[PDB]
Structure 1
Amino acid sequence: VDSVCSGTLQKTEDVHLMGFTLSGQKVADSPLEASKRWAFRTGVPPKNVEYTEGEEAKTCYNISVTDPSGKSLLLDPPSNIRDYPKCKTVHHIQGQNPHAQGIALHLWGAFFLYDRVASTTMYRGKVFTEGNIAAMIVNKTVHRMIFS
């Protein structure tokens, strides 16, 4: 129904934020292609946001990037950053950048997805996949049937 009143939210638990991948959006995810969407920049503070469920990822990345001196250009992961839950193929990459400064920011405005945490930046050594999230109401009964 198109009405504002259509829909019921009984507990906060029934708000579900789902992470959908860019691979699921038929976007090229090869490491060489994927990296063309990532870029370094200063003056931007990385932000993180919690979500509840996510799509099984086609591909993920486990990346460490430094400057020539060996100092990471990627931020150390916060306590609450865990490797993405379900990746079919992880791309482990470790290297250095000759002339880059700041932090890794996704170009499309998409998020770096980890385990129930989306971010505007790439965390060093943590498994992630690219994606976006969407909010919806799912009651427990509906939730129980899907996941079981």
Structure 2
Amino acid sequence: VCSGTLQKTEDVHLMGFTLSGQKVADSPLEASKRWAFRTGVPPKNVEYTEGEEAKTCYNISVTDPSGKSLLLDPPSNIRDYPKCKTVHHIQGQNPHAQGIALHLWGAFFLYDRVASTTMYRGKVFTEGNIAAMIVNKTVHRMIFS
């Protein structure tokens, strides 16, 4: 239990690891099967410090047959994911859709320094999860040089 010591609150970091590193299907067709729309669930957000370089990113726009986009309006703090190898530009349709888009696996829609329960409109993301770990000032400096 006494193993390890935490000096400053800046040293505790939350690293987001993409599902791409978990060797899951990166194709947008199979990736679109991992999300679904549901009403009656509030969207929650958690900020993290570091993240992985994503292999595939998605900029989706699911719209009503009338043209109404069903994705939520992104708050100001939400921004595109920093590093993506390829960004899939997708435009979908769903007439029966209700509520908001959630992840069926329980993973998070990773945005820049933010993990979200919901996929926001017009913002690049990647599927992933975050992990809590401690790295002191000297160790963190060595990895990033």
TM over 0.5: yes
Distance 1:109 1:136 in 2: 21
Residue 126 of structure 1: CA displacement?
Answer: 0.3
Summarize deviations over 1:97-122 as a string: whole Å, max 9, x none.
Answer: 12111111000000000100000110
SS of equivalent to 2:57: strand
Distance in 1, Cα, partners of 2:65 & 2:100: 15
State the Cα deviation string for residues 57-107 of structure 1 (Å, max 9, x = none): 000001111222222210011000110000000011123212111111000
Structure 1: tracts of 5 or more residues without a match:
none
The match for 2:93 among 90, 93, 96 is 96
Structure with the largest fraction of helix: 1
Alignment partners' CA distance in 1, 2:9 and 2:67: 45
**Partner Cα distance (2:19, 2:39) in 1:** 25
Deviation string 1:25-51 (CA, Å, 9 cap, x unpaired) is: 000010000000010000001111000
Instruction: Give the TM-score taking structure 1 as reference length.
Output: 0.96
Unaligned runs of 5+ in 2: none
Whole-Å Cα distance in 2 between the matches of residues 121 and 91 of structure 1?
A: 18
How many Å separate the matches in 2 of 1:5 and 1:104?
42
CA-to-aligned-CA distance 1:14-33 (integer Å, 9 cap, x gap): 01100001110000010000
CA distance in 1, matches of 2:66, 2:46: 32
Partners of 2:2 and 2:76 lie apart in 1 by: 39
| Identity value in percent | 100
Question: What SS does the corresponding residue of 1:127 show, helix, strand or coil?
Answer: coil
Q: Distance in 1 between matches of 2:21 and 2:140?
A: 22
Moved segments of 4+, more than 2 Å: none
Q: TM-score, length-normalised on structure 2?
A: 0.98
User: In the alignment, which of 108, 116, 132 is matched to residue 135 of structure 1?
Assistant: 132
**What number of residue pairs does the alignment pair up?**
145
